[PDB]
Amino acid sequence: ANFVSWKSRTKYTITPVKMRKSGGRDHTGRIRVHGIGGGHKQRYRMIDFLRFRPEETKSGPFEEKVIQVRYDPCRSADIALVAGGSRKRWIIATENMQAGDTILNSNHIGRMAVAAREGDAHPLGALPVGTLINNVESEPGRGAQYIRAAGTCGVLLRKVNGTAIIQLPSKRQMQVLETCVATVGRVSNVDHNKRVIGKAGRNRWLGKRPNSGRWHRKGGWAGRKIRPLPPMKSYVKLPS
Amino acid sequence: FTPPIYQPKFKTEKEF
Amino acid sequence: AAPKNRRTIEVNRCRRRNPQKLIKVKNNIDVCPECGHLKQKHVLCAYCYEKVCKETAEIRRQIGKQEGGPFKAPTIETVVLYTGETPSEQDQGKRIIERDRKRPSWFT
Amino acid sequence: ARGNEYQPSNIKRKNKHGWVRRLSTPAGVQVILRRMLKGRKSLSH
RNA sequence: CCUCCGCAUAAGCCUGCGUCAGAUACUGACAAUUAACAGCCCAAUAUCUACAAUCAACCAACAAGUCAUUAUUACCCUCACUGUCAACCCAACACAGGCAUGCUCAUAAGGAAAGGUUAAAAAAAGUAAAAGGAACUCGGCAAAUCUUACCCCGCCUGUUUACCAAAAACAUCACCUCUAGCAUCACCAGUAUUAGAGGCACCGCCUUCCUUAAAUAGGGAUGGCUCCACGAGGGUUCAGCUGUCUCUUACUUUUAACCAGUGAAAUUGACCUGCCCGUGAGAGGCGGGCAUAACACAGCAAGACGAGAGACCCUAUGGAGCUUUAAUUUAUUAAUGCAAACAACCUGCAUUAAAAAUUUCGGUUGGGGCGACCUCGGAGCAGAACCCAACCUCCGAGCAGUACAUGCUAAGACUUCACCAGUCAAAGCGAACCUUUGAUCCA
RNA sequence: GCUAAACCUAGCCCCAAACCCCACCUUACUACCAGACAACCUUAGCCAAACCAUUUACCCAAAUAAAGUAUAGGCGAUAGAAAUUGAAAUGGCGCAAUAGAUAUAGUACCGCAAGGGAAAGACAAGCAUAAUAUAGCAAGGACUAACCCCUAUACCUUCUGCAAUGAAUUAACUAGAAAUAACUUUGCAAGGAGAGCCAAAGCUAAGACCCCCGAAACCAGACGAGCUACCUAAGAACAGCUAAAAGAGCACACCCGUCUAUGUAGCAAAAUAGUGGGAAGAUUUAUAGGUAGAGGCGACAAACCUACCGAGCCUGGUGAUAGCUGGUUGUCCAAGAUAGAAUCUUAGUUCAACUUUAAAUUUGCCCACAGAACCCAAAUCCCCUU
Ligand SMILES: [Mg+2]
Ligand SMILES: [Mg+2]
Ligand SMILES: [Mg+2]
Ligand SMILES: [Mg+2]
Ligand SMILES: [Mg+2]
Ligand SMILES: [Mg+2]
Ligand SMILES: [Mg+2]
Ligand SMILES: [Mg+2]
Ligand SMILES: [Mg+2]
Ligand SMILES: [Mg+2]
Ligand SMILES: [Mg+2]
Ligand SMILES: [Mg+2]
Ligand SMILES: [Mg+2]
Ligand SMILES: [Mg+2]
Ligand SMILES: [Mg+2]
Ligand SMILES: [Mg+2]
Ligand SMILES: [Mg+2]
Ligand SMILES: [Mg+2]
Ligand SMILES: [Mg+2]
Ligand SMILES: [Mg+2]
Ligand SMILES: [Mg+2]
Ligand SMILES: [Mg+2]
Ligand SMILES: [Mg+2]
Ligand SMILES: [Mg+2]
Ligand SMILES: [Mg+2]
Ligand SMILES: [Mg+2]
Ligand SMILES: [Mg+2]
Ligand SMILES: [Mg+2]
Ligand SMILES: [Mg+2]
Ligand SMILES: [Mg+2]
Ligand SMILES: [Mg+2]
Ligand SMILES: [Mg+2]
Ligand SMILES: [Mg+2]
Ligand SMILES: [Mg+2]
Ligand SMILES: [Mg+2]
Ligand SMILES: [Zn+2]
């Protein structure tokens, strides 16, 4: 197929980008993921997941003003247009982020624990143990990848040496260098669980389509079965 | 079902 | 139901050469004593009728020219006059259709 | 109900069976070569 | 007198009812659609752009909705080219079908249901119907009317077997289970309130009588439950309504029949093609009787084992599909292990899986289940050479005991009806001094 | 006397020899701007093995011979060398328009496509002249005489045998291809043969003998998503009333297809009329694009993927295979019959038995006695005669 990814834009921008739906299809044109197709046309707002991104020819901790908090069609979380210095960027909004609020993005690992105010980003080394966090990086400067969905919140479980133990929302422990940045608080749109789809049409609007033949293997779906050993073959299906 | 078979048109388009 | 056997030409001849299928000879054909044309007894002579139809068509063309338009049927009688004819006392107050030919012998 | 499977459109015809698409693959080039060998008046569509 | 028709665009088609001349909207010749409509574009590099739409003003949201421009640098010429017709396209057809959009909502546009006749049957559609009003029928199907009530199933709106099934089936919100801690081609420019897969079913809670006169019909005395609403679902019912029926009739149109024109198809061994009884297991044709001038036309459907298709059973060391604890593999992937190259990556060799791949379906017993049997020997079972009652009945053998010449050789014979195989055996040599199966290949 | 009937070269087959202006890859046949993707990679399977699973000949670089030998091989079906040896050089006991090329042409036409692919040019049948006469396989025996009389259960094939199969009819076309031995007739003869091979009368040569059509399939490589299924991009449509931001109600357009009737070679290879469901949505729909066959797609009906999808279509392997069905064409004569065993075998085959031909030789069949068991019938066997 003549499929070229829509994710071709190279320069970050605030303008929503026209994104092409896939239908669950590979670049080969064959269905790779079932149950995807249609839905409301959407525009993609490029999220800057690296909260500590000091502006060009600038460095050090910087503050930013929350211009607005907006619904994002491409996420469970709602996003925040936030402006600092002479630039604007989209970030993931925390639970109580409001328009006009101020946000701190620092790389400073203070000797003492920094007062953790919801919404600001500090290196994990600077946070008190037991603080709720989100938008957690795996490596310093990689960019947030974990705890990004609406209402999610990891816990800074431990800090020893230069390594911090985080409890991901799946209640799995993760080891990250304490120099990696995370933002304080739980992600916004905390009521995303309680939303009721109500009707099949709403899922169709969200772009989920009812799809069958999801396995493509001979015989379709087949649950795993325990293959009895030769000694145990005599007891597999004992008649009544 | 067996589809109908059409004879060639020339058999029936002949003219003096 | 399909035929069980081909019908023979002998059977077919017996069928399609029956007197019921043969064309009957007409015995009402005679000769029009007027013009000597063949006519059936109860039917008008074809040639004489064609004559009358052609003359009527000419008269009606003249009538159409005189009327000049639809929905112009006169509320008065009509008289056809040929070359060398003059309206009579009875033909007074009747629209005159003038024909360029002479009065036909069969017209009166 | 059936029989009208052909819904003509010159764009689709040329894009599906045209000379350029035939030459776009080695298999289609061999299609054209077979038609030329047979002597077809119309090599492509 | 008739039409959701017409006119345009799109798409498609490609000169396909313009003129003339020859033929019976055909052939040939001649002509024609004129750009303003439409198509065919942009000089780039950068950098810009959060703020829907819905009369966009209030109100109302969620499903969150392309609108891409500006600064600098280049730039000077100017209207080319192409579509433009038609009664049209896709359906083999001048096909009652398919066919996007803008306008007209009955036309200002576009058309003609009747070739002529007659007024049979049967057939189709329609209209009307005394009295009755479901008595019809599987069923109130259809028609005419307009209502009532309740069960079963599915929560609902949707989806499906294009062309016999629209459903109780599939989906579905809701819920549950399982898997996954993560970036530059799907999932996803997402990140556990996420994503993928499976199940389940919205939700919510608790843990003999009646009906009719007659009623095989109907209704009522983690699961168990709860039917709000909805349904061309499946049952039942009141009332009404009706040609469904008692029980059919009349009329109109189509069809029909006759006249004229044009003109198929399945089918067909040949036919000079009767009835009764008999035969055969079923007769137009055979036997015995009977009948019997010859042909049209219109009906009918008893026969012509009517025609054309199809169903049921059986078979084939015929296919194909499916499932597996059928057999054979693991080439390929995925894991490991060992070597190889110095962790990644990769090669080779193994092992385990996943996914697959290839292949098969013995015989006898109305079929199937559960069986039993399949070779050999002995007896029934064949009275008197042999052979045979297969199928079948009973019994026992895959030997045991003995000897270790119970060796070697060799005339002549028998034989399980073929062959294979299996038996007996004189003479001779040598020691001593017999009573139950299986080939070839391969090891 | 109509329809017809006939014709002979247009060409073709097999050999030999010889080695054979302009436009056009974009939507081809389109005068005129930033390239870069540029190719290489065991065939498989049908089939034979009477299944099938290892296996099962296939442009080779001198014919013959070695030799179907050595070898290989579920050592079986079958496959199969080499050393060595060393062949010389413009025609038709071909077709003559259903033949010979498919060919007048890869045209017309058919298909979306890949593909498929024609026809034809120079008194047969059917009818008419001239319908028919009781009764019957349509005739035969006849007869003065057509009929009347008497006799007479169509053909082919498959069944044990009549039922069943096929056949409108004419013309043309349409189906027994070969070795191991034998036999016969020549030649020469302990040798034959124009190297090789055979030879204890052989050797050399000739003559005689082994059909046609048909699956469902399998695999390879193409072609197909202008239908349909799903998806992508960017569009469009949805009156009126009720209701009020609704997978809301009634109901147009539009989409569908509940029920009935008509239609059933039809208007239609799924339509028509009425009725009915949806009709601001999980809606309908135009345009362009995408996913391709063991694959796609599927709100799962094994549904749909160009009218025939439990697995598309085309071409090729391919003249697949068929123990099954059907067919298998001059005349005449002669001989000619039921039968055991084994078999993944009982729809087949091989051996036996029977059968046919040729040949050699001498007994063969029938049978009178005599003879064939104890346990406790009819007949049969055997053979001097005849
Ligand atoms: Mg279409
Ligand atoms: Mg059609
Ligand atoms: Mg008319
Ligand atoms: Mg009429
Ligand atoms: Mg009444
Ligand atoms: Mg009743
Ligand atoms: Mg009632
Ligand atoms: Mg009754
Ligand atoms: Mg009804
Ligand atoms: Mg439902
Ligand atoms: Mg519904
Ligand atoms: Mg259906
Ligand atoms: Mg239906
Ligand atoms: Mg009842
Ligand atoms: Mg007529
Ligand atoms: Mg009888
Ligand atoms: Mg008969
Ligand atoms: Mg009759
Ligand atoms: Mg029949
Ligand atoms: Mg015995
Ligand atoms: Mg024997
Ligand atoms: Mg085989
Ligand atoms: Mg020819
Ligand atoms: Mg004749
Ligand atoms: Mg027949
Ligand atoms: Mg499409
Ligand atoms: Mg509306
Ligand atoms: Mg609605
Ligand atoms: Mg669907
Ligand atoms: Mg099912
Ligand atoms: Mg098809
Ligand atoms: Mg064959
Ligand atoms: Mg004889
Ligand atoms: Mg065996
Ligand atoms: Mg057999
Ligand atoms: Zn006269």
Author numbering:
A (entry chain D): 61 to 300
B (entry chain d): 41 to 56
C (entry chain 0): 79 to 186
D (entry chain 2): 48 to 92
From the paper:
The human mitochondrial ribosome (mitoribosome) synthesizes 13 essential subunits of the oxidative phosphorylation (OXPHOS) system. The mitoribosome is composed of a small and a large ribosomal subunit (mtSSU and mtLSU, respectively), which each contain a ribosomal RNA (12S, 16S rRNA) and a number of mitoribosomal proteins (MRPs). In human mitochondria, the GTPases GTPBP5, GTPBP6, GTPBP7, and GTPBP10 mediate mtLSU maturation, as their deletion results in a loss of active mitoribosomes and stalls mtLSU biogenesis at distinct states.
We isolated mtLSU complexes from a human cell line lacking GTPBP6, which accumulate assembly intermediates that contain GTPBP7, GTPBP10, and GTPBP5 as well as MALSU1, MTERF4, and NSUN412. The structure of the MTERF4-NSUN4-bound assembly intermediate reveals a distinct rRNA conformation, which appears to be stabilized by binding of MTERF4-NSUN4 to the interfacial side of the 16S rRNA. MTERF4 interacts with the mtLSU through contacts with h75 in the L1 stalk (nucleotides 2743–2756 and 2792–2804) and with the C-terminal tail of uL2m (residues 275–300). NSUN4 binds to the mtLSU on top of the P loop/h80 (nucleotides 2815–2821) and h81 (nucleotides 2841–2853), next to bL33m. In the MTERF4-NSUN4 assembly intermediate, this region is partially unfolded and wraps over the outward-facing RNA-binding groove of MTERF4. Although the density did not allow for atomic modeling, comparison shows that helices h68 and h69 would clash with MTERF4 in their mature conformation, indicating that MTERF4 binds a premature conformation of the interfacial rRNA. The PTC loop is partially mobile, and nucleotides 2975–2995 form a loop that base pairs with the tip of the P loop/h80.
